[PDB]
Structure formats: structure tokens, C-alpha cells
RNA sequence: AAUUGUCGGGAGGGAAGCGGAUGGGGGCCGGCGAUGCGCCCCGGUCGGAUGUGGAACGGUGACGAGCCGGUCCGCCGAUCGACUCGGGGCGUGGACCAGCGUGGAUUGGGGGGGCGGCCAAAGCCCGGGCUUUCGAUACGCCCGUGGAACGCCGUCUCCUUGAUUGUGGUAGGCAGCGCGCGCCUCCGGCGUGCUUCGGCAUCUGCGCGCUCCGGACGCUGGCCUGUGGGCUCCCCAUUCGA
RNA sequence: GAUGAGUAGGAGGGCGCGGCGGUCGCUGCAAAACCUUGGGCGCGAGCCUGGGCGGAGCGGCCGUCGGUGCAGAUCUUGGU
């Protein structure tokens, strides 16, 4: 015998792939698996890990909060693994470069009118 | 250089003993700085303190062996588990044979056989240990990086004793096997390796 | 930006051979073992040849006076080693112990 | 060209001399001196271009696996020290089991060439495996026996009737063998009689 | 066809795992069922009792599912289905489904002979 | 299906059945177990350029140009290639099962040698002195750089053996070492430095090779329709378990 | 590379039955069912197949659904 807990095996469970059946999400997962393997980038690793997460673990970000966080960094590409929703409490929308899994119609229209772009993760 | 150093050390010890006799006094040998400890009892029906100490010593299986630097703390820890282990002062031959035949290094928490000096260099290169002989010298002399080298060494998985044991339920002093058998651990290592 | 592709990572584990038996593995792990073995064999051959020829030298590491001092010290040490107590502290058992 | 080995081997894989002595004996210093303090550089041998193999007539649907290189090459079979030319051997197996024969030489394949002689016990020039033979202490002079032209190819099958040439060769070889045997008294009877184990005979105690 | 498989087939156990007491009670069938009784000696693995199957008996993956002839089985219902094995004749053999008629079996056999595809039961309904 | 009759096989000293291992008998199996491959000669069929025209068409580009390209058909030269076409020669070759050889891994034995430590062994023997006994002719002590042979412990090494086993399949890698690149009188010797005076990874570079070197290869035999080989099938017997 | 006990209990991956939406097939040159010291695959639930009988239908695969898996209940009915 060997004095080990559960024979030395792990007892923690984490996501290793998306539980969703979305083919586009699967393709994104393949893309970022390749990126993580062949670049060793911490950003890519974080993106890959978040691509596996459930719905409640990918909460949306409001447009007003996005503007507040992007203030002073409009030249950088803001990236969220989740949805971006419109906020009727935000009056002035600056030009922003935004990447997300999905945009609501109102948020996309407001960003495009303000002069930004809505990007997917392949474009990112 | 290491071989010359070992030979010179043995000669110096003999000369010191002889000169002490000639002067008519006594020469007290330096206390052992290194111990080799072998677990001799199974994992059944373990007391909490004994089990915890054996885990801290990295002796999780019967007939596992490990080196241990001699310290007040380590000696007091070993005193608590004395009935479950037998230990002593390893020889240069014992250490060399153990590392050569059953020496496995820990790389990324994996057990890799020491088939090349590159395995040792990858882990202990920062400390100047890049060869099996360097590792042996560090272990035997208890050098500055002894802790790193010893932790790098995976616990030795020794076979059952070739000639058996006398009685593992009694101390070595009473004619059993448990406890400190000092210089006599080397013959046990011969039979167990 | 991708790092260079790797094709030689999936190498089969090298079989472990005991250096104490085969020479090549021992030399690979420790080249000085070759010199150690050569010197040991040559020294043994020289000793055997000297013993056979019976022309061995008469070597004296220690001079005569120091050898005599060593012998005297050893004799004194052996005498104290075999020395025994007088057993005079046990008065009630003097006759039984034979001190008288 | 050096006519003697520079470094005799104390044991297998260890030389008697060290690297410095080997340098001195090989004379690398001499070569450096003669070439001007620098070793002569020799260009790598040019590889032979592969032949223009004709295109295959078939294309397999699977990629056959090429075995990995094995670096071990077999060595010649060893001959036991107890077996020397002229030694009397006891056959332990086959149709001639128990027969006592004379050993002549070891062939290239490692088998032992033996003769009865044929007249004495009916055993012809034959090959016997060393593993099925017992070497005795009895030796007979075989200096006058010539078996140079006999080798492993003598017994090769051409694939019922024994050629007369083989019989003549056996007679010629056995003439000298029998003449040598006649010198030792009772050796004729010894060779004509087979070996057998009787009651209370222990092979592990018999000396042979 | 020369089979591609080279490793020898090794079976850790060739005996069936028969249900306990199926020899005793007719109503108890042979198909394996793991005992769940609290006192069951078979469940407790008492020596000399019925053996229970476990993953340790698993076949070597290289030789798994390989028939004694060195090929793998594939059930074919018609000659059209037969052609799927054209590029795998060194690893796969065809077995004609039990319900195929003799008339179609003849055509399947002829096509397999043309394609060098091994049939395990080519003599059926002949 | 339970259950029953008949025939055939088999077993049975106060249960039967069952797990594991062989064996006897029976039953079954020919993808159960190959006969091809390469190089030549002869004969028979089918096609043969990078040349020249036609039919349709493709890759890329931009479902444009340009460039490149394959399939089929018709001709001048070229006189070659192929055939699961036939015949004749040389070489080589299969499944399974055994024996043997040389080696790797793991492991259990047997026979030696060198060195060191000890009261710098103890003892024994050789000489020089002292001592003088009851189990009567002893115990004995030291002086010699006196001499052989051990004992235990430790350590370094050589040789020789039995057993189980070959997992992988694109590497001439790593480590160590020989021959040539100089000569002589070739069991060896000749140069520069450091040495404990024995020796030393100090000079140690290339080409070609060898090995205990990134996991077994080689040879021979038996047999292939047989009273052969195999079996997870069936009935039994036996040892152990139950 | 390390490792392997499991009642109550939890979970994962699989086997099997009957329908529905699709898809690919089999069958009077013999389907289902049943029978068989024929053979084989899988650790296993099970599956594939030879032979027989039977004499009219049946199966694989992807989704999806359910009155979907028995050795027991002094269980039910029938039979012995
Ligand atoms: K039953
Ligand atoms: K289990
Ligand atoms: K072997
Ligand atoms: K269907
Ligand atoms: K069946
Ligand atoms: K269904
Ligand atoms: Mg272990
Ligand atoms: Mg106790
Ligand atoms: Mg019935
Ligand atoms: Mg229903």
C-alpha cells in the first residue's frame, strides 16, 4: 500500500472544453487552442479558459461601464468574452474598438454610429 | 577531486585517532551529519502523529528510503516514529550505489530516471550541481544545497531485504530491527538494494 | 509570432541500465570512473607481481623511536582496557566477590 | 602502418594507457610539427548518389513500419575449454546417443566436427552441437589427420544414396586416426563401447 | 491479403464471466450481473468463489477486437457496402450479414474476390 | 421453459453444484497453415515524344489577360514500355512449433585477487634476557624497525553460472575508444608542460571505423490435408480452493 | 510520469427494449421468432456469424420520446 489521498489523483474539476454545441464557438476554441499552444501568451490562455465558461460565468458588460473603463484608453482594443448590452443612461459614445462574443442590436448600432467597430475573436 | 577528498578524509580520521592514542587522550569523532532512514512497517492502523511525521519525511510505503540531514528538529521528529523506521549512517559506497541504481530525480513533480547528467543539470544547475558525482558529493558532505539536492532525489523504492529481517516489532538494541543501528545500516542497504 | 515548430518532443523514454554492471553507462554518467578502474587494476597487478617475485621492498613508514613510542602507548591502552575495578565499594559482598 | 596495437586492453572496453600517453604514442605532436603547428584538415567523404530506381508498379494503402536499428552484432560461438583437438566426446542425443567419438575441429558455424572413427563405432564424419556433448579428459593425437578441405559446406544438402567420394574421404581421414588410436592400449574398445549410466551412478559426481 | 497486424494477440482471460448461482437456478441466466447483496461472498471476493469482471482484464489496445486471422470484422449487407473496404483490406475483413440471401451473397463474394477483401463466412448458403 | 419417456456417452464408499490448472476422450475449425516475388530468353496481345492539328477542360490570377497544365482523337518519325498473358532458366521467399548462438533488462548462486583498520590485531615461530610451577613440569613478561601464516570488519576489483523476459519500430544520436593524417630497430620507443617520480582530460583536431553505447537479433530443424496443429466448445479424472 | 479496497450514497461513459422525425438497407434465391457439445468479438452489459426450424416481414445509423431491463415482494396469472 501507499499512503496517498485517492491514490494521488486529483479531486478538482475544471472545464476543459465548451459544454455548448455552437459550431462557431468550437471553431473559436480550436483557433485559441492553436494560439495558446504555439505562442504561450497569457492573454491567449485567459481567453481560451474563458471560452469554456458557462453563461452565468460570462456576464454581460453595459455600454456605460465599457465607456467608463475605456476612458483614457480609446486607442486600445477592448476585449470581453461575453455580451455587450446598450445603456440608455450613457449619453456620449466615443469611437471604440470592441471585441466580444455578441453585441445587442442597439449597442452595435450606437457603437457604429459613434464611429467604432464591433469585432469578433477571429478578427481579434 | 572528490575521490581525492574522500581518500584524504579517511586518512585524516585514521591519523587523528592514532595521534590521540599516542598522546594518551581521546579523540571524539565528529557526529554524523547524514542519516539514511528506511520505513519498515506497513500503512495499516496508523496513529495521526506517526502518519504525519512519515509523510513529512516522505516515507509513504514500506521499504522506502530517504536521506536526512542531522538536526535537532529532524532528530526529534524521527524519535517519534522510531518504531516504524530503521536508520543509520550511510557509507560512501551505500550513497553512490543508491543514487546510481535507484536514484530518480523530480522534474516538474515527475519521477525521471537519472540516465544522463542533463536531467540533474536541468534542476540543480543553478546550484553548480550538474553531474551524478556532484550530486553524490553534495549528499555525502551535506553541502549548502543539500536540501535542494535531497528534495530533487525521489524517495528510494527499495526491495524486500535479501536475507529477511530479524524482528521488526522490536528495537535494534533488543535484537529487533527498529531504531538507530548506526554504521550497521550499510549492510542492510546492501541487502535491500 | 508563432514560435518554431517542434518535432522531437515525443521521444521514447530511455531504458534505465544500472551503471554498476555495464561500463558504457557508468562512463557516460561519470567519465572519471574509467581512470579509477584503470588505476585500480594497474595497482592490483603491480601488487600481485611484487608478491609473486618476492622482491618487495622493506618499507618503514615510522622510524624506530616513534614505533617504540607507539608500541608502548598501545600496550598501556590495552592494559587500561583490560583493567578491572577493585570492588571495594561493596563491603557486604567482599567475601562473595572474592576481594578477600 | 603500425604493426602492433598501441593500447592493449586490460579488460573489455578499458585501455591500459591514458589519454596523455595515447597522445604521446600516436604522435599528434609530430603531425602538428610537420604540418606547421596545425592538424591537417580532411574533407568529408562524398556520398554516393542513390541509383535511379524505377517507379513502383504498385502503391500500398498503408505505410509499413521500418524497424529501429539494432546495434548488436552476434559474435562467434565460443568453444568450451574442455574440448580440444583429439578430445574424446560423448554424444548425449540423437541416433548416436551414448557414442564416444573423436573431436577434430570447430567449424565456422560453431558446430563440432567429429569422427567415430567410422570403422570402430560406425560414426562417420559428422557435425554435433556443443550443447549435446560431454568433453572427456581422454585425448588422442590428431596431428596426422588432415581435414582442411572439410568445412561447414561439406554437409550441405543439395535439395538417399551416399556418394563413394564421401566414403573414400572418410577412409582416408580415418586411416591416420585409427593409427594414432592404436598407440593407446584399450582405446579401441573404449571408442567401440558406448557410455551408459548403471545403478548408483551419479552424473553430478562423475568426473569424465 | 496479408494482415497488417504484427503484435501477437494476448488474452488475459478466455473464460466467460458467468453469473453466480446460474448453475443452481434455471431462472437465473448466465449473462453477467454484479451481486449487490450485503453478505454476498462473490461481492466480497472470497477466495474460491465466482470471479467478478473488472477493467484490469482489458485487452491490449493494439490487438483489441482483432479476429484470430489478424483482421477486424465489418458487417456488409450488399456489394455496394463491400467497396468501403477497398483501401483497408490489410486491416479489415468483411462478414456478410446473417439475413442476406444466397443470390446476393454470391455477388458479394465475387466482388470481394475482385477487391482482395477477406470474407469470414463466404461458404454460407452455398 | 419448468417437467417426462426412449436411445447413445459418461460418473457415483453418508449430497450435488461451483473457482482455479492440467490431462483423457469427444466435437468443431482450412483466413486451421504460404507457394508468391525479383532478374533474364522465346512467343502472343495492348499501347508508345519534348513534334504537329482537333474536341472539351482545369490550377493560379480577379469565375479578366498572361503563365502553367492533364484527358481523348488523327498523322511523320522514334522502336521503347506493359500484361493477374503462355513456356523455359538463376536467386529468393510463408504460418506455426521446437533446438541452438550471441547479447540487453531484472534476478539468485559459485570461485578468486588487491588495499586499509585493529594492542599500527591477538596469537605462532627465530634469536637475548627475567621469572620458576601440583591438572607439576606450567603460567608466563619485554627486546628486535626479527619471519611466515591467519581472524573479523570495511573497501576496490576479476572470472563463471541457472531462471523470467524483448515492451518500441522514420534516429548511426549520446558516452568511451581504435586505424590513417610523422618516424624508428614495432611484447615497444621518440615532443611541450604539471608531477606524489607511479603517472596526468597538458596539448585531445579531422576522415574512416569499433563497443558493455537512445528496449532482440541470427542460424538450423519438424510440419503444412496427415494417426497433423489449435480451441474460448462438451463429458469426465485428478491436486488446491470452496 | 504517478497511481488502483469499497457498504449507504453521488456522478460519468456505455449495453439492451418499443415508438416518432429523417437517413441507409435487408427479405419467398426465405423476414421475425425460436433451437443448437458450430465459431468469434468485448473486462462487461451485450454483439456478429455457421447450421436448423419457421413461412412473412425486419434491421443499422443520427436525433427525439417512453407504461423501457427482475431471482426474490408468505408478490400476480398460468403451467409443472
Ligand atoms: K440457469
Ligand atoms: K471497482
Ligand atoms: K537472456
Ligand atoms: K429506419
Ligand atoms: K447462434
Ligand atoms: K430510438
Ligand atoms: Mg514504490
Ligand atoms: Mg503492535
Ligand atoms: Mg425442456
Ligand atoms: Mg406503451
Author numbering:
A (entry chain G3): 2 to 125
B (entry chain q3): 50 to 242
C (entry chain s3): 305 to 404
D (entry chain b3): 3 to 161, 182 to 230
E (entry chain R3): 2 to 127
Show sentences the authors wrote.
The macromolecular machines that execute protein biosynthesis, the ribosomes, consist of rRNA and ribosomal proteins (RPs). In plants, protein synthesis is realized by eukaryotic 80S ribosomes in the cytosol and 70S-type ribosomes of prokaryotic origin in chloroplasts and mitochondria. To elucidate the structural basis of cytosolic translation in plants, we report the cryo-electron microscopy (cryo-EM) structure of actively translating cytosolic 80S ribosomes in a rotated conformation (rotated-2 state) from the model plant tobacco (Nicotiana tabacum) at a global resolution of 2.2 Å. This resolution allowed us not only to build the correct atomic coordinates for rRNA and RPs in the 80S ribosome but also to describe ribosome solvation and metal ion positions, as well as chemical modifications of rRNA residues.
The polysome purification protocol we used delivers actively translating ribosomes; accordingly, the reconstruction of the largest 80S subpopulation showed bound tRNAs in A/P and P/E hybrid positions as well as mRNA and an NC. The resulting small subunit (SSU) and large subunit (LSU) structures and the cryo-EM map of the entire 80S complex with bound ligands were subsequently used to model the actively translating 80S ribosome in the pre-translocational rotated-2 state, including tRNA-binding pockets and intersubunit bridges. Despite the expected codon heterogeneity in our ex vivo 80S ribosome, the translated mRNA chain was well resolved for at least 12 nucleotides. Likewise, the densities for both bound tRNA molecules were of sufficient quality to build their atomic models, to exemplify the structure of bound tRNAs despite the mixture of tRNA species expected in the ex vivo specimen. For both A/P and P/E tRNAs, a codon–anticodon interaction with the mRNA was observed. In total, 91% of the rRNA residues and all 33 RPs within the SSU as well as 95% of the rRNA residues and 43 (of 48) RPs within the LSU are present in our model, while a few surface-exposed elements that exhibit flexible structures have been excluded. In addition, the solvation of the tobacco 80S ribosome has been modelled, including water molecules, polyamines, magnesium (Mg2+) and other monovalent ions. Using polysomes as the starting material for sample preparation allowed us to obtain the tobacco 80S structure in a different physiological and conformational state from the recently reported 80S ribosome from tomato. Moreover, the SSU in the tobacco 80S structure is rotated by 10.6 degrees relative to the SSU in the tomato ribosome. In summary, our data show that the formation and disruption of intersubunit bridges are accompanied by local structural rearrangements in the 80S ribosome and lead to the SSU rotation.
